[PDB]
Enzyme design. Structure first.
Site, PDB file in Angstrom:
ATOM      1  N   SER B  48      36.801 -81.290  -0.577  1.00 34.99           N
ATOM      2  CA  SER B  48      36.170 -82.597  -0.399  1.00 34.99           C
ATOM      3  C   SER B  48      36.672 -83.344   0.844  1.00 34.99           C
ATOM      4  O   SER B  48      36.055 -84.350   1.194  1.00 34.99           O
ATOM      5  CB  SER B  48      36.318 -83.484  -1.615  1.00 34.99           C
ATOM      6  OG  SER B  48      35.713 -82.889  -2.769  1.00 34.99           O
ATOM      7  N   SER B  96      33.721 -88.668  -4.397  1.00 36.53           N
ATOM      8  CA  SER B  96      33.622 -87.257  -4.036  1.00 36.53           C
ATOM      9  C   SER B  96      32.349 -86.593  -4.609  1.00 36.53           C
ATOM     10  O   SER B  96      32.425 -85.472  -5.123  1.00 36.53           O
ATOM     11  CB  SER B  96      34.867 -86.507  -4.506  1.00 36.53           C
ATOM     12  OG  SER B  96      35.775 -86.269  -3.464  1.00 36.53           O
ATOM     13  N   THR B 187      40.956 -87.525  -0.874  1.00 36.80           N
ATOM     14  CA  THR B 187      41.508 -86.408  -1.642  1.00 36.80           C
ATOM     15  C   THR B 187      40.578 -85.187  -1.574  1.00 36.80           C
ATOM     16  O   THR B 187      39.403 -85.256  -1.166  1.00 36.80           O
ATOM     17  CB  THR B 187      41.652 -86.765  -3.126  1.00 36.80           C
ATOM     18  OG1 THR B 187      40.382 -87.286  -3.532  1.00 36.80           O
ATOM     19  CG2 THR B 187      42.756 -87.740  -3.476  1.00 36.80           C
ATOM     20  N   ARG B 228      49.242 -84.761  -5.845  1.00 32.17           N
ATOM     21  CA  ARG B 228      48.641 -84.828  -4.515  1.00 32.17           C
ATOM     22  C   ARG B 228      48.851 -86.187  -3.858  1.00 32.17           C
ATOM     23  O   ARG B 228      48.856 -86.256  -2.632  1.00 32.17           O
ATOM     24  CB  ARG B 228      47.121 -84.710  -4.517  1.00 32.17           C
ATOM     25  CG  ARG B 228      46.582 -83.360  -4.944  1.00 32.17           C
ATOM     26  CD  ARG B 228      45.066 -83.438  -4.969  1.00 32.17           C
ATOM     27  NE  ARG B 228      44.507 -84.462  -5.849  1.00 32.17           N
ATOM     28  CZ  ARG B 228      43.217 -84.778  -5.946  1.00 32.17           C
ATOM     29  NH1 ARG B 228      42.299 -84.143  -5.228  1.00 32.17           N
ATOM     30  NH2 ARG B 228      42.839 -85.741  -6.776  1.00 32.17           N
TER      31      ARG B 228
END
Ligand SMILES: C[C@@H](O)[C@@H](C(=O)O)[C@@H]1NC(C(=O)O)=C(S[C@@H]2CN[C@H](CNC(N)(O)O)C2)[C@@H]1C
Ligand SMILES: [Cl-]
Lengths: 242, 242
Positions: B48, B96, B187, B228
């Protein structure tokens, strides 16, 4: 446009013993809601809310070179310690660095300043009172209705300035971000002409809707200043803008 | 610029039993640091994170009209419930919404997509695997170092695209606004080729400094996915940045 009174909003002001107005428009300023028809169109000094047009004009005249401009501190005393440092455009907005915006206005000059405020339909368009102080203690005045109209044009890239410059100022006005919720806003506090006036103006994007807003109130003392944000926030939450 | 290995940042990885890399660059000194030089140069599916160049190319080519375009939900089931609704450009990036960006890629087409990824120096520039899935299960690969180079170019408007389109994508990437700083970020989670990779890339503006960042890690299962953000945040907190 058309402005419609929501009487139920007054409870929010009387409960705190506030004289003020909130204007809120969904999708466009074609149709706005308010607690007070009269006060919605009453004009007051913009104080630091004028940093929004001032920044746009600074970019448009090339006085601010581009988005990455650094306003360098020459090391000479400034009135507030938070101002005693190099600042970006957003930084100068966040710390309310009046002197940076004053030097911008001086460099823009009265002729250019007058032209852009008229193209922008910005309040009574009167810049009398000295190039560095007309928005602080001079004759300029603007209403909550006019602030929403102006901010709507900025949102749409419809002001008489490049789209690039409008985008640059918009990014510097972001105050809250979440995946489907984004707030652009700006406070002001006019203390030099009575009565003192507190402002909070901006717009909110929530999913695929947008709402433009402007709030002002008489400010008795500094302790009342948080109501500038808390009253409009409560009303916006009542419309499900959370 | 320069890069230096700083193995102390390994504390956070070894604690969480993570294999991954962080790259953090200070713009003014043109200097980067990383816990792992080798992994910083390894190249992975962007997943993404590809939404950044894809949005830029979407706008450049006219596929995306402007930042006010709304991508309507056609009512067909989507992989995530949060995708089952109309989205703005910012909203489609931030949640996303892959199906939105597959449609953009289709309309961009192979010739144009290639031309742009070559201009942008984006990873291996390999768009084999089908015009609507090459960044998710095809041949495209990019490293952490490459991501920070790309993001610095975007920041400076030095990509081969209009300033206007670069700025549109910049505001769409804002993810956190604080008094002292602004975070732009994105992200990614690559699941269609093993081992799974989690990404977080972006930049932080603080004072008059700008810090570019890229983080990736092997994802053993869905429960690790917050790391993350949390490992790079902890490092940037240690560094006095956020
Ligand atoms: C610095 C001053 O000349 C004003 C300006 O023109 O920028 C400032 N602008 C603002 C503003 O709200 O935008 C202010 S409010 C003053 C400084 N910040 C304090 C915030 N008060 C509270 N409690 O509501 O958070 C009180 C100041 C008067
Ligand atoms: Cl003054």
């Amino acid at each position: 446009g058309s402005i419609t009174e929501n009487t139920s909003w007054n409870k929010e002001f009387s409960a705190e013993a506030v004289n003020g107005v909130f204007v809120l428009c969904k999708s466009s300023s074609k149709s706005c809601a308010t607690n007070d028809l009269a006060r919605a169109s009453k004009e007051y000094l913009p104080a630091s809310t004028f940093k929004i047009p001032n920044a746009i004009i600074g970019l448009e005249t090339g006085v601010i070179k581009n988005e990455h401009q650094v306003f360098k501190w020459d090391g000479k005393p400034r009135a507030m310690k938070q101002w005693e440092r190099d600042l970006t455009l957003r930084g100068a907005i966040q710390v309310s660095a009046v002197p940076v915006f004053q030097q911008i206005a001086r460099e823009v000059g009265e002729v250019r300043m007058q032209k852009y405020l008229k193209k922008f339909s910005y309040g009574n368009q009167n810049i009398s009172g000295g190039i560095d102080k007309f928005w602080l203690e001079g004759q300029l005045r603007i209403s909550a209705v006019n602030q929403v109209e102006f901010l709507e044009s900025l949102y749409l890239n419809k002001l008489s300035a490049s789209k690039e410059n409008q985008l640059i100022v918009k990014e510097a006005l972001v105050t809250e971000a979440a995946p489907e919720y984004l707030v652009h806003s700006k406070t002001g506090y006019s203390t030099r002409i009575e009565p003192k006036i507190g402002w909070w103006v901006g717009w909110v994007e929530k999913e695929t809707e947008v709402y433009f807003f402007a709030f002002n109130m008489d400010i008795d003392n500094e302790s009342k200043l948080p109501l500038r944000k808390s009253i409009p926030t409560k009303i916006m939450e009542s419309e499900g803008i959370i």
